[PDB]
Amino acid sequence: MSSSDRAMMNAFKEITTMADRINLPRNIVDRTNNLFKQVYEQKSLKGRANDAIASACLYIACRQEGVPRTFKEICAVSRISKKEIGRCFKLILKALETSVDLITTGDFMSRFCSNLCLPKQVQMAATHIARKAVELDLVPGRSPISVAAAAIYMASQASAEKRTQKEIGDIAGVADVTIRQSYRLIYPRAPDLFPTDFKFDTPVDKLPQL
Amino acid sequence: AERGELDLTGAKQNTGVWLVKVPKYLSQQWAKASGRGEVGKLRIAKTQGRTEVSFTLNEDLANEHPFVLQSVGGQTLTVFTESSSDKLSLEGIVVQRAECRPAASENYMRLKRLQIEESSKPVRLSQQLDKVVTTNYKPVANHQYNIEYERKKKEDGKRARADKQHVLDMLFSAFEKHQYYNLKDLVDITKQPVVYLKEILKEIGVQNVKGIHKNTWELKPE
DNA sequence: GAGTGTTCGATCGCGACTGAGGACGAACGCGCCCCCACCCCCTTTTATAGGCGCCCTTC
DNA sequence: GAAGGGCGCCTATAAAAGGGGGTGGGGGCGCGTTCGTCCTCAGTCGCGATCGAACACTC
Numbered sequence: 273m274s275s276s277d278r279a280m281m282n283a284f285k286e287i288t289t290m291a292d293r294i295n296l297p298r299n300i301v302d303r304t305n306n307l308f309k310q311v312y313e314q315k316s317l318k319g320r321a322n323d324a325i326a327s328a329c330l331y332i333a334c335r336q337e338g339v340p341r342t343f344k345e346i347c348a349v350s351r352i353s354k355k356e357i358g359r360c361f362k363l364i365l366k367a368l369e370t371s372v373d374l375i376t377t378g379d380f381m382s383r384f385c386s387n388l389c390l391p392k393q394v395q396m397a398a399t400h401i402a403r404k405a406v407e408l409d410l411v412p413g414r415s416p417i418s419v420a421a422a423a424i425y426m427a428s429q430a431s432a433e434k435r436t437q438k439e440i441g442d443i444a445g446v447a448d449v450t451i452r453q454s455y456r457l458i459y460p461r462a463p464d465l466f467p468t469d470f471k472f473d474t475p476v477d478k479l480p481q482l
Numbered sequence: 483a484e485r486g487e488l489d490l491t492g493a494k495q496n497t498g499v500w501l502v503k504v505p506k507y508l509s510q511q512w513a514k515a516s517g518r519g520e521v522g523k524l525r526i527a528k529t530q531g532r533t534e535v536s537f538t539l540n541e542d543l544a545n546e547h548p549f550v551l552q553s554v555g556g557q558t559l560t561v562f563t564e565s566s567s568d569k570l571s572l573e574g575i576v577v578q579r580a581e582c583r584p585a586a587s588e589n590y591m592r593l594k595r596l597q598i599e600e601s602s603k604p605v606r607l608s609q610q611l612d613k614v615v616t617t618n619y620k621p622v623a624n625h626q627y628n629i630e631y632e633r634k635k636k637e638d639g640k641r642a643r644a645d646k647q648h649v650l651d652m653l654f655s656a657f658e659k660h661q662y663y664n665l666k667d668l669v670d671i672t673k674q675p676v677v678y679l680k681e682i683l684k685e686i687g688v689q690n691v692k693g694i695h696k697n698t699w700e701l702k703p704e
Numbered sequence: 705g706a707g708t709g710t711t712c713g714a715t716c717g718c719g720a721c722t723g724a725g726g727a728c729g730a731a732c733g734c735g736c737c738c739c740c741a742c743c744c745c746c747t748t749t750t751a752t753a754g755g756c757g758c759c760c761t762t763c
Numbered sequence: 764g765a766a767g768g769g770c771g772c773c774t775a776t777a778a779a780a781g782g783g784g785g786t787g788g789g790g791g792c793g794c795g796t797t798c799g800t801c802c803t804c805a806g807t808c809g810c811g812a813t814c815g816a817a818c819a820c821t822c
Contacts, residue, residue, distance in 0.1 A: 639783075640784075674783095695791070
């Protein structure tokens with residue numbers, strides 16, 4: 273007595289089943305449910321796969337909550353290619369006529385350093401290193417996450433909690449050479465990029481090269 | 483001489499055999515039989531009102547087991563064999579049954595240890611994990627979809643129609659096996675759009691529900 | 705005286721009457737496969753930059 | 764043999780045409796389920812037929 277909504281109805285179960293896999297707050301999911309409902313009500317994009325729209329709604333809500341999750345992450349929980357999510361994303365921005373926000377490195381300092389169980393001091397040091405680097409535009413090319421990971425790497429390399437680039441690379445998903453390149457870009461200022469409130473475990477002079 | 487033929491020689495010889503129950507730990511000692519297979523020696527003492535049988539382990543096998551004799555009454559027991567050449571043979575009838583038991587060599591502690599020793603397992607209990615967070619990598623595109631892609635790029639179903647002839651010839655081949663076929667199965671032999679295929683099946687045939695709803699097609703009887 | 709034929713009573717057979725049980729079907733129901741409808745999908749060049757996979761070499 | 768770094772590749776966007784695809788919406792035909800109908804036997808009683816018996820007419 274409701275065939276029209278049944279793909280939408282199933283999409284929100286699939287939205288919930290997509291929010292389930294990484295323990296997302298319900299408020300985010302609710303806006304997402306509201307976002308889809310809105311996108312559904314337009315029907316202008318009915319010629320599109322529901323699961324991509326759900327996944328795109330999800331990427332947007334995280335940004336709407338000021339805590340974006342990478343498409344790479346969003347891909348982990350969906351079958352949709354990053355390309356089609358990006359494509360659908362654009363369509364939704366056009367569909368719902370609403371603006372977005374730029375990403376910040378510090379928003380991912382928390383969980384990654386957490387995933388490495390790095391202490392806040394390293395985590396916070398990395399954030400400054402990242403923050404100082406972007407204010408100076410030391411890396412006008414590399415993705416901020418790639419830039420952040422190298423900062424994290426540098427930071428981890430400035431503490432006892434050193435890790436190999438491949439492990440970090442594995443956690444961030446970026447290429448190990450991309451960090452290696454991004455590192456080469458930040459390395460000239462490795463010493464001065466650190467926060468004034470820091471305690472070296474290894475001299476900046478003794479920071480490795482790659 | 484036949485597979486299902488059973489040799490009755492033992493029975494007809496009235497051949498007798500002895501039956502002895504033996505604990506597993508001893509039997510595990512016996513799988514390590516000394517030499518060819520010797521495990522020890524059996525000692526039998528009978529008196530006017532008492533009979534004693536026991537077995538003593540081979541000195542090698544060691545690196546007294548009294549017997550309890552049991553009745554075989556109430557049920558006739560015989561032994562029958564299957565060779566490695568699958569030939570069948572009756573060796574004999576059971577004239578004695580017996581059980582190997584401990585005597586003045588253990589109370590309980592060793593047996594408890596023996597039971598423990600046999601186990602050597604965590605029973606299956608969930609012994610922690612303690613704590614981990616094995617988060618799973620985002621593959622920027624669905625892996626299987628990507629795997630699908632390597633396959634997909636190899637060939638397309640969008641093929642050409644140079645066949646207002648090769649397909650009918652193939653139709654004679656299929657319909658020679660059965661008068662009528664399902665449309666999906668007709669689609670399987672073909673490499674062309676169904677609508678185009680629909681145009682062909684209309685051309686030399688008609689179709690049915692065959693009393694099964696399914697769009698089943700067949701060649702024209704006329 | 706005697707022998708045979710007919711009819712109500714009585715006796716016995718019958719079927720009607722009522723209910724429960726077993727088997728059957730038809731209305732209801734389920735879902736797949738069919739098809740039309742609506743709309744993406746593929747290809748090139750030219751320019752650009754970020755990310756990246758594979759190989760070659762060296763450990 | 765395994766690790767590593769370098770070469771080179773892919774991708775992202777813009778724009779459209781021809782032919783096949785695909786998903787959605789819509790629909791039809793067969794199979795599955797459940798309750799009601801139909802059929803039958805058993806049981807009691809009324810009814811009809813049949814057996815039992817007395818009076819009148821003919822030989």
